[PDB]
Amino acid sequence: GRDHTSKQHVRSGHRTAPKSDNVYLQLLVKLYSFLARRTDAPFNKVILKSLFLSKINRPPVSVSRISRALKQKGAAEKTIVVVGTVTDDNRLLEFPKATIAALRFTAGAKDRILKNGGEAITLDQLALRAPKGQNTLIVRGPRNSREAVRHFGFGPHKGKAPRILSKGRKFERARGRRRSRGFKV
Amino acid sequence: VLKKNPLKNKQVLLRLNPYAKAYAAEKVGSAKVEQAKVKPSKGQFAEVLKN
Amino acid sequence: SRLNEYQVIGRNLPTESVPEPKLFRMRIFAPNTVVAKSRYWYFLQKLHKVKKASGEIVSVNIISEAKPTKVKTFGIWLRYESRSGIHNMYKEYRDVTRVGAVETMYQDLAARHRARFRSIHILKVVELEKTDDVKRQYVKQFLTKDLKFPLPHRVQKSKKLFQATAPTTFY
Amino acid sequence: MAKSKNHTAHNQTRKAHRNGIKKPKTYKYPSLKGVDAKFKRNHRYALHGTAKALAKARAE
Amino acid sequence: KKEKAQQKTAEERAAAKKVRKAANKEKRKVIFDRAAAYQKEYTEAERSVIKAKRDAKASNSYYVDAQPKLVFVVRIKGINKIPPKPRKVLQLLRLTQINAGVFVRLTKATSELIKLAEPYVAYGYPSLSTIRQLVYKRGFGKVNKQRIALSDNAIIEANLGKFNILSIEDLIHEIYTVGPNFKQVSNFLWPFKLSNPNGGFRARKFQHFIQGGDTGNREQFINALVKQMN
Amino acid sequence: GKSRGYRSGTRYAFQRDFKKHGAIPLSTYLKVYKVGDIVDIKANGSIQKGMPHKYYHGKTGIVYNVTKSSVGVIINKVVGNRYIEKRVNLRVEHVKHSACRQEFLNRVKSNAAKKREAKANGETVYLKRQAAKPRGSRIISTEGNIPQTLAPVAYETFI
RNA sequence: AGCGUGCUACUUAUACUUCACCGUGAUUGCUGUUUUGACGCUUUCACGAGUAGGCAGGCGUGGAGGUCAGUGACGAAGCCUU
RNA sequence: UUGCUUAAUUGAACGUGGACAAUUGAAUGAAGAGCUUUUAGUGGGCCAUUUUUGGUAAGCAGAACUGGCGAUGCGGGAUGA
RNA sequence: GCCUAGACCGAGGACUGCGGUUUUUACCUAGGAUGUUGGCAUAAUGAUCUUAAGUCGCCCGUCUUGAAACACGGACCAAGGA
Ligand SMILES: CN[C@@H]1[C@@H](O)[C@@H](O[C@@H]2[C@@H](O)[C@H](O[C@H]3O[C@H]([C@@H](C)O)[C@@H](O)[C@H](O)[C@H]3N)[C@@H](N)C[C@H]2N)OC[C@]1(C)O
């Protein structure tokens, strides 16, 4: 026998491949698995793990967030990398000339990038023109902005949103939420 | 592919420990010690026998 | 052969008050040195208010028999514990070594008094040198002039299971 | 008729040690909720002034 | 092409290995001298203690040996029905199976640790030949969380060479003389996986060596037990 | 019926020491507590205000808040399978500094001084503490100290 | 062949040691030889009890889209059979 | 720095700048650490050593810590949770 | 250090490594069994079925702290059955 100091036969708990069956995503995984295996640039390994991520773990990245990243001191010429969708933002006043590498561009985002003289490229083109991720800047979208996240960890005095179907004065605003109705939690 | 015991395999013994050649050549395992004959207990230490 | 006689010498660890603490010696009958030092500390913790952690063993030495092929009579003084109480007793043994007599004593107290080794303190083992010192008739009867005796009814040990000749016990 | 076991803590430490017992995480800055309101009020101004002074000296 | 292509490869290997052996002969001379020097200091330490013991008798004194600095601890109890505190202690000693053995450097801290594990282990002070035999026959290294046989000095140099351990004899010397990098050398060794003793234990194991059992500190008879189990 | 009131079970824990009743010596009120200080909690039964619950009697914690007559102390409490951080308001009569910390700060100063001495000397010293090691070899003289033999003694009654 | 006690050998568990094989988990490397499986191949190590229960990978049945220009009155399907 | 505090140029809390480097300040271990969501079954227990209450006592009734059985075969205790 | 009696195993499959002997860009016992001989192929050999012998083996399902139970359902078979 053995007095085990840890649970036996535990899987790593990390995704090792895309759950997706998109053949072209698999082609990209193939390219970046080669790159992460043969190049030891940390960027390629990060990109490889990113290609495995599920949809909610790849939030869309707006062009305004990209522009704020491009305004960082020394970053006006970096190649912006997004493993996910780049979306348009109609709140933006101006957008600069930039090279953005992404999985997907919405039509508005691509029109705005191209109109200001920039370049909208895919991840294989990025690998060809920067095999080690030289002069890149990875940008990630906000994971916790999801509406589902509002209801996580709900409980007394926690300040989270209730799971509720209708909104109004008759819907869960009485006893338990008001000192005039018993107590407030 | 196969662990070999140096205490049995002479070649593996030499691979791990080059000095094992000199130890055998010099007969270190059966070395005479040069000394004289003394009895340091012939006095008080003979309180080992009786008090 | 079960036992050896040891001297064990120990002292208290030196401190500032007592730079040269007094050396003490015990004669111990033990199977090996580990038990010998254990017994030394057992008796030192009874006799004195000392512990093993505040002391040290100085020396452990076999005490060989002086005349291993001389027949002797030993008197042994003992303290043992019964099921019911605590008793002193004195018994005599014939042997050629002190360790042989002590081993016989342990067998004898196991047999007649059901005294285990843990229940017995050996107060003193003394070679009785004058025949007048021998007090017990069960050993005294082997100290008479021209002792001779037969060994009636000899039983021969057989190698085979079946013997073709009738048994004999002559001798 | 319905008499049963009333209470025991048997097996309770065994359950507690399957995933516990975890210490709360420590942070460099603690929350000042629950600290004396007069101290906390002035500490707000002290931090605000320090940033303004550092933002000044860095210019020169 | 293939016989030609493989012959051309064979020559490049054959010339490159010619360079390596010359580089390995200077390193093998280094570990040869260390092993010879270790032998000399083992012999001088034994003789010096013998001379001191003799001189003490003549000068009406008693020589007291230095206390042992090293123990070898063998777990001889199974894995069921262990109270939590000794269970945790046995885990912290890397003794998680029966007949597992590790080397421990004696201090007050580790002595009280072993004290907590006493009714489940047999321990004592290993001789140099005991350590040598254990390491040579059942010595394994922890290389990237893997039990790797110590079949070559390269395996030892790659993992412990940064602590100036270049050979199996360096490792044995570090264990036997409780040296400066004892922690790293002892932890690099996988727990020794011994057999049951040829000849069995005493009639009943689970009582102290002093009371006629097999547990506790037996102090030089650990070597006979290792010969039985190794 | 059972009884589980606030001070149940505190008959002896909250008693004053024998011949130690009455007025509090003023040294209790002259001590200065700062956020981050480590304090032992001990309830004084003669000060009914700002008292600890019996759980915190004999516990040690960090000071996190300082008010007119009291300190706020952080205590970790095992609740089920985890610790909960507790915040207890205690008047200074129920609080005292912890001495181990003063010892540790002294050691910090000594380590710094020794390291500076070695750096000025040109060498390196070891600052880690060590457990007690086995003793080395030694020679014992028998001058006026001949080993004296002891034996177990016979049983005697004295009743 | 009882009781107390010491000793020598011996007997044998799914336990321990070495080795083989299955699986699980981790792990080494694999594109100018990546070769139509890279969901693949390959190096190495450790581990394997299980009710209630969770999950994974498979086996089997009726019917539907596609494909094998599939089997079949020279015998389909069913049924019996060391 | 401050609107708090001191008779104060005193403090308090948080800082700029400077210095102290692998002995970064005990041991041993560490199939790594942290974090989140979601959902099953269960919510009759019972036994042993020790501590322990009621009862003459109980294979009785009720607590404490740990180990077990339940959920588990295997060698031994003839047989047996 | 030396001599000597038995047992079980032979995973892998060009080469590549570490060492040794050096008499040698060589050879080795050193990164896992080869050499040789006899017999057989109308068969020595292996598997299954039937039966004998040795050894072990209570009746499943279920509720239950606890079932082989002198606890309950079940004579048997097909098809249906959540
Ligand atoms: C000196 N204090 C002791 C305390 O140490 C403890 O003693 C136990 C003793 O009771 C155990 O003995 C116990 O358990 C054994 C067996 C089932 O293990 C039983 O045979 C025995 O009847 C039972 N009393 C004994 N084996 C070890 C001592 N430390 O419990 C009894 C005690 C008097 O409180």
Count of CB atoms situated within 10 Å of the CB of F132: 9
| Strand G nucleotides with an atom less than 7 Å from a protein beta carbon | 3-7, 9-12, 15-19, 23-28, 30-31, 34, 38-39, 44-49
B47 contact residues in F (CB cutoff 8 A): 146-147
Q: What own/partner pairs with CB < 8 Å and gap ≥ 24 does A89-94 have? A: A89/A62, A89/A63, A89/A64, A91/A64, A92/A63, A92/A64, A92/A67, A94/A67
Closest alpha carbon to C95 in C109, C76, C114: C76
C113 CA to H19 C1' in angstroms comes to 81
Cβ atoms C12, C48 nearer than 8 A: no
Cα distance between residue C39 and residue C24, in whole Å: 14
E82 contact residues in A (CB cutoff 8 A): 3
Cα distance between residue F4 and residue F55, in whole Å: 13
Q: Which run of H or of E encompasses F70?
A: strand F70-79
Q: What are phi and psi of A103, to 5 degrees?
A: -70, -45
Q: Which residues are registered as beta bridge partners of D12?
A: none
Burial of residue F35 (number of CB atoms within 10 Å: 0-12, 13-18, 19+): middle
Residue type, F93: E
The b-or-e profile of A51-65 (16+ CB within 10 A means b, else e) is bbeeeeebbbbbbbb
Q: Which residue is associated with the tokens 């996240």?
A: A149
- D contact test, residue of F82, F84, F87 with most D CBs within 10 A: F82
Q: Which run of H or of E encompasses C36?
A: helix C33-47
Count of CB atoms situated within 10 Å of the CB of A117: 10
| Strand H nucleotides with an atom less than 7 Å from a protein beta carbon | 1-5, 12-16, 20-32, 34-38, 44-47, 61-68
Q: Do chains D and C touch (3 or more CB pairs under 8 A)?
A: no
Closest alpha carbon to F76 in F66, F86, F67, F89: F86
Length of chain D equals 60
Q: Which run of H or of E encompasses E156?
A: helix E153-160
Cα distance between residue A67 and residue A65, in whole Å: 5
Residues in CB range of E164: below 8 A, 6 or more apart? E170, E181
Cα distance between residue E47 and residue B34, in whole Å: 11
Chains that touch C (3 or more CB pairs under 8 A): B, E, F
Cα distance between residue E172 and residue B19, in whole Å: 14
Cα distance between residue E169 and residue C165, in whole Å: 68
Closest alpha carbon to A32 in A118, A126, A107: A126
**What are the structure tokens assigned to F146, written together?**
């001949």
Question: Within an 8 Å CB–CB cutoff, is residue B2 touching chain E?
Answer: no
Cβ atoms F16, F24 nearer than 8 A: no
Chains that touch E (3 or more CB pairs under 8 A): A, B, C, F
Cα distance between residue E74 and residue E90, in whole Å: 10
Using DSSP, state whether C40 is helix, strand or coil: helix
Cα distance between residue E38 and residue E32, in whole Å: 10
Q: Which among E66, E106, E110 has CB closest to F136?
A: E66
Residues in CB range of F97: below 8 A, 6 or more apart? F31, F33, F37, F38, F39, F40
Q: What are phi and psi of A35, to 5 degrees?
A: -65, -40
DSSP string, F75-131: EEEEETTEEEEEEEEEEGGGEEE-HHHHHHHHHHHHHHHHHHHHHHHTS----S--P
Q: How was this structure determined?
A: cryo-EM
Residues in CB range of F153: below 8 A, 6 or more apart? C47, C79, C123
Cα distance between residue E57 and residue F147, in whole Å: 13
Cβ atoms F50, F90 nearer than 8 A: yes
Closest alpha carbon to E57 in F150, C20, B47, C22: B47
Cα distance between residue E175 and residue E130, in whole Å: 11
Q: Is the CB of B44 under 7 A from strand I?
A: no
Q: Which residue is associated with the tokens 């640790």?
A: E113
Using DSSP, state whether C146 is helix, strand or coil: coil
Helix, strand, coil content of chain F in percent (nearest 5): 20, 25, 55
Chains B and C: how many Cβ contacts under 8 Å?
A: 7
Angle, helix E222-229 to helix E128-138, in steps of 10 degrees: 20
Chains that touch B (3 or more CB pairs under 8 A): C, E, F
Residues in CB range of D50: below 8 A, 6 or more apart? none
Q: Which run of H or of E encompasses F41?
A: strand F38-41
Cβ atoms A150, A161 nearer than 8 A: yes
Cα distance between residue F129 and residue F131, in whole Å: 7
Cα distance between residue C47 and residue C44, in whole Å: 5
DSSP string, E85-153: HHHHHHHHTT--STTEEEEEE--HHHHHHHHHTGGGEEEE---HHHHHHHHHHH-EEEETTEEEE--SH
Cβ atoms F37, F61 nearer than 8 A: no
Cα distance between residue E214 and residue F145, in whole Å: 38
CB contact under 8 A, E52 and F137: yes
Q: Which run of H or of E encompasses C37?
A: helix C33-47
Residue C112's nearest nucleotide, by CA–C1', is: G4
E6 CA to I13 C1' in angstroms comes to 18
Q: Is the dihedral of CA E82, E87, E89, E95 positive or negative?
A: positive
Secondary structure of chain D as H, E, C letters: CCCCCCCCCCCHHHHHHHHCCECCCCCCCCCCCCCCHHHHHHHHHHHHHHHHHHHHHHHC
Q: Which run of H or of E encompasses E19?
A: helix E2-58
Strands A119-121 and A99-105: parallel
DSSP string, chain A: ----SS-TT---SS--S-S---HHHHHHHHHHHHHHHHS--HHHHHHHHHHT--STTS--EEHHHHHHHHTSTT-TTSEEEEEEEEE--TT-S-----EEEEEEE-HHHHHHHHHTT-EEE-HHHHHHH-TT-TTEEE----GGGSGGGGGTT--TTS-PPP--SS-STTSS-STBB-GGGS-B-
**What are the structure tokens assigned to C147, written together?**
């002792």
For residue C122, how far is its CA from the centre of ligand 1 (angstroms)?
28
Q: Is the dihedral of CA E82, E87, E90, E95 positive or negative?
A: positive
B51 contact residues in C (CB cutoff 8 A): 25
Cβ atoms A3, E91 nearer than 8 A: yes
Residue C113's nearest nucleotide, by CA–C1', is: G4
Residue type, F158: F
**What are the structure tokens assigned to F30, written together?**
């002259």
For E100, E118, F75, the CA distances from E85, given in Å and listed in that order, are: 19, 12, 25
